[PDB]
Symmetry: C2
Subunit: 120 residues, 2 copies
């Protein structure tokens, strides 16, 4: 089972992601802040991270940079629909993809699989 | 002005893409089949290609493989909403991203900009 780390401060969003991902058959662990995420990354070595761009402490942008100093597993940012820059910025700083909130399940699961499979 | 090659055989889709992209300030060129695309690529050297996965001649998958022999500019696949495999497959064979039809303008422009800016 592919291991996914869901990093989100809003429990209902983190929980609906964890629900859909476990259902599809992933092993899912949840972090609710920045530093806890970087810790969990070293212990679990997730296959993919879903990272809120708007974490309140250490930003998703800083989580991403700090993770990338050591690890290259796929990172997908979670962003609002209404901010172009939030979608764009993660791809400049080392994330692989983004999914917008609210997301369809359909799109979440495609994006996670496609990023798990991505070429070379 | 960034140069976009739109590769799609459905004139209405190709036209609405050209309309929105021009409006946003891109230079847009349109190919309606596989072989014409590959030619236009060497000829134009687009900064990004938007490629229908379902072209009737050479597939979007074969087009993307042919192009990737020589070029590594971003390629975004255009796919239906209802097929997970069509979204996943492009990313395995050398494409960078996918956008689903019908796409919002919002999402199309954000994807194109994010892929144009993408790190390393």
């Amino acid at each position: 089972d592919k291991k996914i780390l869901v990093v989100d401060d809003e429990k209902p969003i983190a929980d609906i992601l964890e629900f859909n991902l476990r259902k599809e058959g992933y092993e899912v662990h949840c972090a609710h802040d920045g530093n806890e995420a970087v810790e969990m990354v070293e212990e679990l070595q997730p296959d993919l991270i879903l990272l809120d761009i708007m974490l309140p402490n250490k930003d998703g942008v800083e989580v991403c940079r700090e993770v990338r100093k050591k690890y290259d597993m796929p990172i997908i940012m979670l962003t609002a629909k209404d901010s172009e820059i939030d979608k764009v910025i993660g791809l400049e700083i080392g994330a692989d993809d983004y999914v917008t909130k609210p997301f369809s399940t359909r799109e979440l699961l495609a994006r996670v699989k496609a990023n798990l499979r991505r070429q070379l």
